[PDB]
Amino acid sequence: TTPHATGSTRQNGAPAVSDRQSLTVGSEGPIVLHDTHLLETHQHFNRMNIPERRPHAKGSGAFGEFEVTEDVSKYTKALVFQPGTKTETLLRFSTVAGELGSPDTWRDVRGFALRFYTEEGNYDLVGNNTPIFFLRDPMKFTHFIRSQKRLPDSGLRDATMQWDFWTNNPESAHQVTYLMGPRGLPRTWREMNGYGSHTYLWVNAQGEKHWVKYHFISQQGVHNLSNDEATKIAGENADFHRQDLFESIAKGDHPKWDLYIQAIPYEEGKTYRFNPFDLTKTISQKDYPRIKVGTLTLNRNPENHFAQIESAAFSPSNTVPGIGLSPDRMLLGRAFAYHDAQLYRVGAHVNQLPVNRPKNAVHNYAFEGQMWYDHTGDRSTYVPNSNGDSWSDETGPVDDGWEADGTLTREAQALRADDDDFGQAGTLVREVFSDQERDDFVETVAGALKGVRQDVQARAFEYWKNVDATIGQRIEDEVKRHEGDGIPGVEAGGEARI
Amino acid sequence: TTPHATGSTRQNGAPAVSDRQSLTVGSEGPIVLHDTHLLETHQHFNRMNIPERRPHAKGSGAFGEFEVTEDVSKYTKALVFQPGTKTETLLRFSTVAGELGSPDTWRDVRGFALRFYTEEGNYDLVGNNTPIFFLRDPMKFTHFIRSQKRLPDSGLRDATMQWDFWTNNPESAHQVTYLMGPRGLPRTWREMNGYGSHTYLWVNAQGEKHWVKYHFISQQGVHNLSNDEATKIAGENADFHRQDLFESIAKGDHPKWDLYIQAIPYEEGKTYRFNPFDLTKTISQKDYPRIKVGTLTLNRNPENHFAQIESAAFSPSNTVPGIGLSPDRMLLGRAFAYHDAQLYRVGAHVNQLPVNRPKNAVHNYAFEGQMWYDHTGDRSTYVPNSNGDSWSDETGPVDDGWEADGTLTREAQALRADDDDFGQAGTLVREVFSDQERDDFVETVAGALKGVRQDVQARAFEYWKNVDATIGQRIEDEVKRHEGDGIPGVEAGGEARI
Amino acid sequence: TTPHATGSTRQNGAPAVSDRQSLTVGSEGPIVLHDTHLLETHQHFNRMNIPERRPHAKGSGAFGEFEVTEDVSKYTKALVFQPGTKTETLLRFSTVAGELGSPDTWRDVRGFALRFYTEEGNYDLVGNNTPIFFLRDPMKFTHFIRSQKRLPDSGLRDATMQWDFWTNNPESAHQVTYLMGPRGLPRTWREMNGYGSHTYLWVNAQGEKHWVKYHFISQQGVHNLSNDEATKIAGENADFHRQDLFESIAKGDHPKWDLYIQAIPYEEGKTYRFNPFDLTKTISQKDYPRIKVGTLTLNRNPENHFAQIESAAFSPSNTVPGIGLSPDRMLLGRAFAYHDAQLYRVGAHVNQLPVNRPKNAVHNYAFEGQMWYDHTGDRSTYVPNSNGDSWSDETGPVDDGWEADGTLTREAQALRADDDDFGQAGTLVREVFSDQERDDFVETVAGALKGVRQDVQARAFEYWKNVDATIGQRIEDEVKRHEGDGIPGVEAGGEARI
Amino acid sequence: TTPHATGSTRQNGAPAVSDRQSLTVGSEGPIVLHDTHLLETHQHFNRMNIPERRPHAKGSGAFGEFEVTEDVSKYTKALVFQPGTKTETLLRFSTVAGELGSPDTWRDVRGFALRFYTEEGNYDLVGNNTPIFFLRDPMKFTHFIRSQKRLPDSGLRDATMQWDFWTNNPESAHQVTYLMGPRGLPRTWREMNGYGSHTYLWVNAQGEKHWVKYHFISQQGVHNLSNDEATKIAGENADFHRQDLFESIAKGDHPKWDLYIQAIPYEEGKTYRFNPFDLTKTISQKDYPRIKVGTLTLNRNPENHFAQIESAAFSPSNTVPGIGLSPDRMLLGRAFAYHDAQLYRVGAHVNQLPVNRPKNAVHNYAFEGQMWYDHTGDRSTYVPNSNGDSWSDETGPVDDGWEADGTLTREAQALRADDDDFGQAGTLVREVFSDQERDDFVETVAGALKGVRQDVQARAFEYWKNVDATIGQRIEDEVKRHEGDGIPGVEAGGEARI
């Protein structure tokens, strides 16, 4: 390269001389303080780690493309979803509870975080492999996630703490049922479905509004593992899912999902018999059928896992024109929480990293800070200005809002006609599951209750009978026999647990 | 508590009102920006994680006591090792390569980081479950650890990268042999030995010097698992070792280790036939026998894992009077590197956290910074001063140094009479291992080479024949038969690996 | 101290040996990497600085006591304001625009940040030396502060940018008038008044509500400097105010302020002819007279400026029972913004530093993070729990809220009968100022406009005529004569400005 | 721009809608939590500040070009200094003690930090406007800088602390003399000289070594201000120097400096009668005359002060082939300290910001970390490797080293024949200063001693008599008369100082 090159450089671009021996006073002497190559390489190594995501620490992903193949222009003006549009994507899959090195095949919810690099900005649909969640208000979220993680003294996960939380927060029943059924253990990420979970607002060119749910249906089908199979794989290959996805794309096999929405007319959101703003509820497909939008294909692996996946920063706040949030309190908390976490996790200029930059021109009133890579030159730092540096100043009602009225309060959402904590769970167990799925469910739930502190077990029996009397008695019988599956990722009991 | 109490507070000590519902405009309305309890709890949750240790992310520990029961005052003036002395301790055990959530029973070196809370400061003996290491100069360390972690694109561990490094750095043979033998898989932390590895300097009251090795011999014996057993446990219980230690102490069973040293007279350090400043070498016990010092007992579990173990910050630089470092280049790099990592990992006042504070009075010229909990009031910020605020000013040769002479260089340490890369490895395989250990070793090493890229396998066969011709041919035969154990924690081959 | 002591320690508590010479290979040789005392002291020094506050970087303060001497129990249940109560306080004074080293006597608003260490938590009244502000919605705040700071290319403050902002945001007129009058330059912090500015909610024991303004009237009177005097002092003594306060307390001279409130009945807040939720408005004392509460006395200097003042973290969100926020949008933004800034500026455990800790027992659902000094042991990390670890769960309307109704919008607050941008400014200039104050005001404002870009000057003449036709013509005449005072802290014109 | 554009974007590139009003529930209602544009802009604003440099917080600079016009190839192989070479530069000027907002015209040393963007990396000559410094060992540096900053309780600078340090560290006399003479107050940065201060190693193509000093002589001459003039300007224009430089370049007036070196033959470094490795010493130009190299011209202002100047990160460790460090202990400490400070101040990827990137290809073994903008793709993370990813492995003595021999010690450098603390100071006062400069010096030093605590004043009189008996008696006489200049930036005495 240069006349004095040595095969590598220091950080300033000068030849490094050696990547293999330190600078010493003679062969036998001490290292000197001015071994700058030693200092720079150690100091960098010491700063390679960044805080893991909380939650969803363990994951990986791939790039691809979304292709619109239907006409949903009547429901939305969003450029990404206009007829024929092809958009570059990035999808990160994850578990929830486990940390950075934790086995992929623990029983858990999976994340399904999808970015669309649109002509009007980055559009993030940060979903999960379930249409619902455990909770309906974000004040409970911190407590739920901590219940799912480790005991403060011993540092062990503990099914007693999990069940103490779940039983004391019966809104959790719908999603815990789903978690304990077949789908708590996907065989691969390619073989699970993806959902937005929340209701979102779609707005058309004329300003008319619909409430929407998103459903990504795998073209590879839904395939799951048993508890015993997942536990075996956890030991043999802690990165089974990560490996599977990367190898599949490497071999040219491009996993696909079809996107469908449900669309509720604006005024019907207030009157529907289940609350669409309640994240523990599904919306009947009889009442609001799925409408096809198009197809997602993953076709390109990362070249750098840390820069393109670990550093990726997805947010529900990354909406685009034609798509808004909704009165779902959980979604409203998420609009604050992700960007906040990322400022700490990654840094103040997280959105200037390549994977997080939009394709379109950014013109944003934010300046300075640590690691300001793409500065604004002499552009105006204030508005209005007499300098030819533009700004935004639309007044009046926004196109992606709604109405509200009341006193400031902290209380449960009002029940719709058919809202409760246990009904939809009960449908799932009685009507959706097969006989064999029911059998397996009883083995799972009894297994998850083994060794749990008796007072909490008794509350869990009442909880499962409220879902369904027959399943609940079956679970209780099996737990009183000291039977049931080992659950990958967690256990109860013993002198280091509750 | 207070007249207006509600059961919990915000950060300012005021009643929090609700830990369970957010502040909304009516039951059905949006959350308001001024839900300060929601913001404070989310913002804290978002900042709970700190970067994991690199390396040694996965670990746990316990408090105890060291009791001196012999007289080694002739070799050292250190208060902690004077006859009869009892000192409070903290011991953190760990693996090396795996991240925060990784299974405890992966094949790996274990850490054995021991702090003594002495009357003359915190004395840290930051050791491992092996007397040696893979390398003899710290410029190689960053490269070794990265070889032990994940592929940059796919994020998978890869035995090809591990073996490419090891074969290209034959100084690694002694420790890789130890790693691939019985002791790469302890059954429990209670059932492994601990070692300082490095030579350290001991200095007596009269100033006379000895070079010392530390050996902690478990009173519970050395007990190991097979590859197959460890892989099974990795799936069933990723925190097997953590759990075992906590439960054992909880039950009143106090694990013990006896400390012995070897003591080389100062002048003999320069002449000994193996280089004691070379971390890939053991010192013959025939030449320098073990001398008993005393007994370590662990007897108290943490009450808070994160504050007392995760935040603990051990450093080889934490010497005390009577104990010094040595010309071992690896130890000299460690004296810089740990404190540096901790400033980033934990913060600038890491040593003001309770677990890291000394028992004795600190009088240190450092001030301000983020999170300055224990400030110095109006004390002098400079020296000398006319203010009655003391400082240190000893001139001349230090009591814990040595001599050096030469030109500034980057080169291998000079060989002693019997120094090489393969000899001591060869002794271990031929003379220390039993027949059955040899058999198992061949299954381990062949297993670890399965699927490794052929060019690297061929180099590995030469490497193992250099250790011992018979073991090397046995390994090569078994690898060419496509046989050998699955190794917990790693594999090779396939479209997502080298 | 210890047998081997040397006069100071390293961070681990061991003797440091020397604070005055580095560890070298002979007298003439290089410093060795393992000079750990050198590394620790440099690495700490390198991390002493933390980001300065934005805004209000330049300031200082003192501790004292608040004594209630009247009965305002009818308006509030807050313990701190109940008859007879004596409460420890801390008060930090500041400028706004200038950075850490900037002269105290620049023309500017002053901060008046008062903490009360109450029995029901820390109560922060974070005010200023003015009853109003420049703006009525916090989206404008970032832009205003940047207009008040430096040009992006040259790094100079610039009166053109200041006036471009002010003229394009005519809501600023009331406060700019106050800024350009006598009170923009206090002689000392002891000789200025303090105000809450915002309307706050007070709530009595029976739940009845009043809207309140706070007024701290100096017992030392209101004394100001001329522009020329302040500029002279800026050169001679950049820390004039800091010095004055510390010396005055050191000499035993305890500066005092009397607290008065105005109290508007709840329902009258909606109907009053000026909007009390509009921070650019004062409330007539004829309509709502001042009601005495008690007396503030400062009587104790800090022993450590950095730990007790620089690290202090005040927030309007630090309310206590009996005191709430209000529909003032500016206050509502501040409830989020201060705690957020402090997490970055100081750290995640900012509220565990001594100066920021409450006197009463904290029971808060937040755990872990960097620098966790006061950990929660084995306490429950979730709610509800079966572990005896309490939490809060009040449901329904809060005691310190109010009502709202409408669609989501971005628009100006609705005008009350007498709301406008220029009226109250006009009263101040015409009716409150003396003849001599008017004269000085014209010299100040003309001075501040000297060298400002002509197009912006013309807008400023219209702006000042809208305040008052006579003052505006006088200013314009003087600016067209190229006359007026030099303003401490800023200028316009030239090749490095707009 | 886009169909739905509004004049600005959020961080994701989507239209922001309004930079001027917040999202509220009706005109009169509260702001909602999901005003993401409000949150993003406030959260960014709150993170714009980064820690100021310690020391040298206050400064500015400009870009330019260096042109070699002589032949010094016989002394160095460095590409930047080969005949005819033209190289892009960046120069930052600064004071030392004052913080970010402090007046430019305080009495102080000035920094002269020059980067050359060479074909073999960034070459940083981080100098000052003086050929010497206050100290000769870096363990004293932290203490000196803190002595120059603020009292721990009151936060005031204090000449008593300054003089207590200086008198107790008489090595300081040479540089304090220079500081208190004419050159402590440059009129402009354009009108001062620049120096490397330290001895550096130059190495030619054949490996032959010389010790070198760098001297940048202003073509605008050396022009200074009186104390009274500088104090006046401090009040009137705190950014006088910053403004001057920017306006001068804006007007097309390109300030220039001629570079000269002194060159000492390698073996003569050990024998010279003054120690060239002692930073408190100058080298006689009679013994080693100046040799011209070329000319520095500044010709381009920054477009963004924060990105190009505030974030610039200069280090003496940024040497290039042909230029090395030296046995000067102060320089050896600086090789560690700057890069360390920058990791905290700016971040782990400070050297990836544009202003800090080299022009040539970087091939450096460092990966991951926060804000990794320019990732290494799938390149090898270790060495040696079988992957075609190069590394460095030169063995033996380095081309830019030297010899050493001795025991590890902490002691003063050995004196050369003519080394002492006061001699060179004495020459400066007696022989270099004019009569009128001597007069002014007496007024400066007496002024700086006014109000200083008597015990420290008495030590200062002995100190100045040791420099020169006549100057010392003159200073003492004037101080006992209570006379002398006000010093811009500092004073003594009173109840808030020592």
Ligand code: HEM
């Ligand atoms: C929406 C408008 C405002 C916002 C977003 C805002 C934001 C901030 C921020 C972020 C800080 C730095 C906090 C820290 O780092 O500790 C601060 C400081 C300060 N603010 Fe504001 N501010 C606003 C308006 C005001 C008003 C109207 C007042 C007076 C009523 C005020 C008084 C102060 C004071 C006195 C400080 C210094 C606190 C101290 O001494 O530590 N601010 N502000």
Ligand SMILES: [O]
């Ligand atoms: O999540």
Ligand SMILES: [O]
């Ligand atoms: O390590």
Ligand SMILES: [O]
């Ligand atoms: O502020």
Ligand SMILES: [O]
């Ligand atoms: O410096």
